[PDB]
């Protein structure tokens, strides 16, 4: 369940990064040495995602990868991205903050996963444009 929480936080960070086109929040999250820095990023990334939701540029969907998987569609600057997985719940944020209060290592783990998701999606999108 700890890995599932970390994976859902990583999906939130990856969606926020792909939508904003800025690594700054993921950099802040992966370099955090206090609960203050982690919590500030968790707010700021959700505030970016909230704007994308209100603009209908961020939406939940299902995608067939032959069973349907939960996904998040992100439209940014005319690029379309799809992140596979769920976004964190309020309980996931609270349980993740409790994990951070024990060990800030979990912020680095979530940041490393988020950057991996974003890099793979950006590479695939650039390859399809070149073809």
């Amino acid at each position: 369940e700890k890995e599932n929480i970390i994976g859902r936080i990583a999906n939130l960070l990856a969606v926020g990064f792909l939508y904003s086109e800025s690594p700054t929040l993921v950099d802040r999250f992966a370099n955090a040495l206090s609960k203050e820095a982690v919590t500030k990023v968790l707010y700021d990334v959700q505030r970016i995602v909230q704007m994308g939701i209100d603009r209908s540029e961020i939406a939940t969907t299902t995608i067939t990868i032959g069973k349907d998987y939960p996904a998040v569609n992100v439209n940014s600057s005319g690029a379309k991205y799809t992140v596979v997985g769920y976004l964190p719940t309020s309980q996931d944020i609270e349980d993740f903050l409790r994990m951070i209060e024990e060990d800030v290592y979990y912020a680095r783990k979530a940041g490393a996963l988020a950057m991996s998701i974003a890099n793979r999606i950006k590479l695939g999108s650039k390859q399809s444009k070149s073809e």
């Binding site: 700021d44 505030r47 704007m51």
Partner: protein, 303 residues
């Protein structure tokens, strides 16, 4: 050396903006540590960067130099202070890159003869033979006075953020190094022109401070023009390193005067003068020249 501390009173201004979130423009804020009877508190307070002040000062210097006749660079003629950093700027200006360390001085002199801004404000070249010139004018962030147990500063939203506060800031300027190469080496042709223009360059640099001391800086002045007013100002002219006390405590003129006297005593100084402008009726002391406006201060400094 000319050092100074100044206190301003600003109401309903938005002069420096930072990264915007959603449809809201954010004013710059910084943390500060404040001492109270119960202990220490960490408070977030609006601030203004020093780079904007430097930009305004350099723009005023460019205008004054162009009006006078001193040389100005091609790019610097436009308000874009990239200076001689990248190869493209050198190509546009038409200056050969340095070959080795021995030639560095020559390169510096050449640049120093094509742009007054590159002389007063310094510059940096990165490459096989890097070159440097530290700025002759030093500024810092603008922070409201951290006096008492209450910070006299407010910030609100209107979306646009608007603030109000009692700001303070200090500045330094060394006029004894203007029109002087900062690299060690044998003399090269062209220094005679620098010696000739030293006086004019120094006068222009001194004059340029009027813009900052008057309140001509910051952005968003088209629709959010602020209402500024001068309250207290201290300026010191010496021949040895010195720095007046920050304008946080109510009594910072007397302390800086006493420290100036004792510093002249200790460091075998020869010249030490102080000028004070007071409008809030705070303690000053004795044996100090009292002026009425900033123009008189500028005239006296020039004289």
């Amino acid at each position: 050396m000319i050092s100074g501390s100044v206190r301003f009173l600003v109401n309903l201004e938005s002069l420096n903006g930072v990264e915007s979130i959603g449809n809201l423009t954010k004013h710059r804020t910084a943390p500060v540590v404040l001492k109270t009877s119960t202990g220490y508190l960490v408070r977030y307070v609006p601030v203004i960067s020093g780079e904007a002040l430097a930009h305004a000062y350099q723009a005023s210097l460019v205008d004054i130099a162009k009006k006078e006749g001193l040389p100005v660079g091609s790019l610097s003629s436009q308000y874009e202070f990239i200076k001689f950093s990248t190869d493209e700027a050198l190509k546009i200006e038409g200056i050969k890159e340095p070959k080795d360390y021995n030639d560095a001085r020559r390169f510096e002199v050449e640049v120093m003869l094509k742009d007054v801004i590159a002389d007063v404000g310094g510059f940096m070249y990165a490459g096989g033979a890097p070159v440097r010139r530290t700025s002759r004018i030093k500024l810092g962030y603008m922070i409201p006075a951290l006096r008492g147990d209450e910070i006299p500063a407010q910030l609100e939203a209107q979306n646009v953020e608007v603030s109000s506060a009692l700001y303070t800031f200090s500045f330094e300027l060394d006029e004894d190094l203007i029109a002087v190469p900062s690299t060690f080496g044998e003399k090269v042709k062209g220094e005679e022109e620098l010696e000739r223009q030293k006086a004019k360059r120094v006068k222009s640099a001194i004059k340029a401070l009027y813009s900052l001391l008057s309140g001509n800086f910051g952005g968003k002045r088209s629709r959010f023009l602020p209402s500024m007013k001068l309250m207290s100002l201290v300026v010191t002219k010496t021949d040895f390193p010195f720095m007046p006390e920050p304008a946080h405590d109510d009594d910072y003129i007397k302390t800086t005067i006493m420290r100036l006297g004792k510093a002249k005593g200790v460091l075998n100084g020869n010249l030490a003068k102080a000028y004070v402008i007071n409008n809030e009726g705070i303690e000053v002391g004795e044996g100090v020249t009292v002026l009425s406006t900033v123009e008189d201060l500028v005239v006296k400094l020039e004289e």
